[PDB]
């Protein structure tokens, strides 16, 4: 699963992670989210031809093969109307549709609107460690557009993906506004006689996908590019 | 005309209760199939089971779908509903178009979809409301049975997450927690989760 952010009017890269034992077309889907998913188009291989859906500008979906086995779909002219989880797909011998992966795709008017995520995180109360006997910690990353994020739980160098819970969509910060930054709460819980060894290290680290190297940018501030921002805490002594 | 409809809104299943998916669809077609699948959180579509127009009902491990062929509804049935079963369900329609028969040319007809999240039957209900101090502060809502709705927070100052599911694989023990907090110097823990509906006996600390 990857995330792409682009600005209007430019063009995109959408690639397809699917390995197909048999390759003759290879369909393109997309999914809004309150939309059905629909194809929008697919590769023949043998002939090098893009077969598009009627209603569909010419030239708007190019579907690149640089190697053998891989395939590439090209967008032009991007609107936030582009924005979604494109697909790659292709029928198998099963006759079942396969679909690799997938790749979600967010187009802004104004690349001013993405912003990397504040991470906080905050100590277990007292009371649960006396109470419920274990400590519960919570991590939040606050401010950050477009929606792709990944928070990852790291405990004494190591990932830790059990005793550890994360929404499955972040909020808005601002639910009236469309392009309003998002925010987002994990927990991690542990006994309290691991909580309250001070040696133990306990890292909230979240995954952002920004610009580029290749994106422009000419703002004041930091370039929101592609950024890896964590938060620490250490166990308590009680 | 060739069309998919899934009507239901979000449904809300216990873990190891039956749920069942609703499904029809038009088509001018003599000979068909019926795609299930499942569209994890992370975005992965996953394929289920294949129903077939002149082959019988189709059950394969937990899933099982119930075909009414003059009715034209495909239902899908998810009997064990474990927690990693929660995930967007889609219903798709295998699309002729060439008179001699299916091609690999030939695409699905996909559903608005119906997302399904299933919740865990608390043993040991503790409902209580922590207030957590920061490294520089949340409240957090914690132990509560999952038959408790969250309601979320009525002024726009304040932001309140949904129930999320905790496991420890270790100590084989599961529970629903919470998140709320605000920008708001003066906010008290007492006060933040007023709209939503909540257990008479919610434990609070003594404030300090």
């Known amino acids: 699963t990857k995330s792409v952010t682009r600005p209007t009017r430019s063009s995109a890269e959408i690639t397809c992670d699917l390995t197909?034992?048999?390759?003759?077309?290879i369909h393109w889907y997309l999914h809004q989210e309150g939309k059905a998913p629909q194809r929008l188009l697919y590769?023949?291989?043998?002939?090098?031809?893009?077969?598009?859906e009627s209603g569909l500008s010419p030239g708007k979906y190019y579907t690149h093969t640089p190697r053998r086995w891989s395939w590439i779909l090209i967008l032009r002219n991007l609107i936030e109307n582009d924005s979604g989880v494109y697909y790659c797909?292709?029928?198998?011998?099963?006759?079942?549709?396969?679909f690799g992966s997938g790749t979600t795709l967010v187009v802004t008017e104004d690349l001013k609107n993405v912003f990397p995520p504040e991470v906080a995180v905050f100590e277990p109360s007292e009371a649960e460690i006396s109470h419920t006997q274990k400590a519960t910690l919570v991590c939040l990353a606050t401010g950050f557009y477009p929606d792709h994020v990944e928070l990852s739980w790291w405990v004494n160098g190591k990932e830790v993906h059990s005793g550890v819970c994360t929404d499955p969509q972040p909020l808005k910060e601002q639910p009236a506004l469309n392009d309003s930054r998002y925010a987002l709460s994990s927990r991690l819980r542990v006994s309290a006689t691991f909580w309250q060894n001070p040696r133990n290290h306990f890292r909230c680290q979240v995954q952002f996908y920004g610009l580029s190297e290749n994106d422009e940018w000419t703002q004041d501030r930091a370039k929101p590019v592609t950024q890896i921002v964590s938060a620490e805490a250490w166990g308590r002594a009680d | 005309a060739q069309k998919v409809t899934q009507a239901q809104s979000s449904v809300s299943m216990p873990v190891r209760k039956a749920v069942t998916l609703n499904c029809l669809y038009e088509?001018?077609?003599?000979?068909?199939?019926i795609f299930w699948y499942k569209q994890l959180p992370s975005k992965e579509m996953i394929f289920l089971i294949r129903?077939?127009?002149?082959?019988q009902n189709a059950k394969s491990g937990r899933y099982s779908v119930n075909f009414k062929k003059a009715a034209k509804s495909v239902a899908l049935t998810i009997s064990a509903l474990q927690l990693e079963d929660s995930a967007k369900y889609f219903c798709?329609?295998?699309?002729?178009?060439?008179?001699?028969?299916?091609?690999?040319?030939?695409?699905?007809?996909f559903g608005k979809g119906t997302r399904v999240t299933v919740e865990p039957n608390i043993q040991n209900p503790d409902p209580a409301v922590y207030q957590l101090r920061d490294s520089k502060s949340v409240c957090l809502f914690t132990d509560f049975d999952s038959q408790t709705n969250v309601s979320q927070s009525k002024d726009s100052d304040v932001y309140i997450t949904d129930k999320c599911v905790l496991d420890m694989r270790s100590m084989d023990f599961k529970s629903n927690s919470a998140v709320a907090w605000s920008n708001k110097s003066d906010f008290a823990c007492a006060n933040a989760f007023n709209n939503s509906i909540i257990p008479e006996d919610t434990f609070f600390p003594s404030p300090e």
């Open positions: 197909v034992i048999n390759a003759f077309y």
């Open positions: 129903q077939g127009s002149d082959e």
């Open positions: 797909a292709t029928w198998d011998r099963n006759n079942k549709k396969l």
């Open positions: 798709a329609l295998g699309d002729q178009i060439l008179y001699w028969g299916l091609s690999h040319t030939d695409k699905l007809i």
């Open positions: 088509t001018s077609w003599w000979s068909y199939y």
């Open positions: 590769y023949d291989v043998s002939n090098s031809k893009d077969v598009l």
